[PDB]
RNA sequence: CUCCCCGAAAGCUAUUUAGGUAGCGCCUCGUGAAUUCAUCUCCGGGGGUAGAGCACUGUUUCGGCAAGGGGGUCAUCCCGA
């Protein structure tokens, strides 16, 4: 019960469990128990040593947790210094991808703000 | 009424005490006992004043160095320069 550095639950089903490492998803998930021959609906718990090892070489295909938060800090990074309108809205917190903000945008900028 | 000898104090402590009083200090008379007491010289002592000084406690002026702080020029998301 310990992938990728992180621990991931051992009363749940393996496609679900393995959903908890950052970078997997339940496509990704779904592939990685198909690589490895194992079913879905076992849970991790029941699961040999010599199966959760057959699981951690298949994620490591995958940029995942601390390697995929650097790329992606990264990416935002890169937008933020070229000055391009996309790093300028990364720097005001406003929406990135021309939503309206006139109204609502409150996902970017958080609760609302009194006068 | 007279003569002879010595000769103060106006301090301390306490007091419904403060211009009163009490004990002590200072005056007098008497008795007793030590080279007892004083001056000077030499010897043994503690000292924290005068003066001085500025390590300490504070205060003070000038210069040097400078953490830092602030005021600005950009930058500004974080940086920062
Ligand atoms: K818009
Ligand atoms: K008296
Ligand atoms: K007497
Ligand atoms: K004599
Ligand atoms: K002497
Ligand atoms: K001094
Ligand atoms: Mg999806
Ligand atoms: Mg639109
Ligand atoms: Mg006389
Ligand atoms: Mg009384
Ligand atoms: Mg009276
Ligand atoms: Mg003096």
Redesign the pocket.
């Known amino acids: 019960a310990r992938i990728a550095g992180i621990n991931i639950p051992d009363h749940k089903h393996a496609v679900i469990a393995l959903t908890s490492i950052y970078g997997v998803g339940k496509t990704r998930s779904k592939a990685i128990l198909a690589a490895a021959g194992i079913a879905e609906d076992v849970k991790i718990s029941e699961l040999s040593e010599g199966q959760i090892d057959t699981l951690r070489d298949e994620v490591a295909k995958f940029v995942v947790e601390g390697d995929l938060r650097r790329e992606i800090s990264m990416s935002i990074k890169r937008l933020?210094?070229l000055?391009c309108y996309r790093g300028?809205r990364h720097?005001?917190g406003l929406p990135v991808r021309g939503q309206r903000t006139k109204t609502n945008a409150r996902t970017r900028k958080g609760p609302r703000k009194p006068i």
């Open positions: 933020m210094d000055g300028l720097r005001r």
